[PDB]
Write a protein that binds this ligand. Structure first.
Ligand SMILES: [Fe+3]
Ligand SMILES: [O+]
Ligand SMILES: [O+]
Ligand SMILES: [O+]
Ligand SMILES: [O+]
Length: 54
């Protein structure tokens, strides 16, 4: 599945890994993240993430 990078701090949201400590199970697509989800490192909103793909 896809990876997305936080343009602020460099955290990688890996869809295969999810973010289970913050309520997101593995295999959760970025588009399916709640509107209130933020970067677990720096707190950046979803707007500041970019998908790693051409
Ligand atoms: Fe971040
Ligand atoms: O990706
Ligand atoms: O994970
Ligand atoms: O899941
Ligand atoms: O936002």
């Amino acid at each position: 599945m896809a990876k997305w990078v936080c343009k602020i701090c460099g955290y990688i949201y890996d869809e295969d890994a999810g973010d289970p400590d913050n309520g997101i199970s593995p295999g959760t697509k970025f588009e399916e993240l709640p509107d209130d989800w933020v970067c677990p490192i720096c707190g950046a909103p979803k707007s500041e993430f970019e998908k790693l793909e051409d």
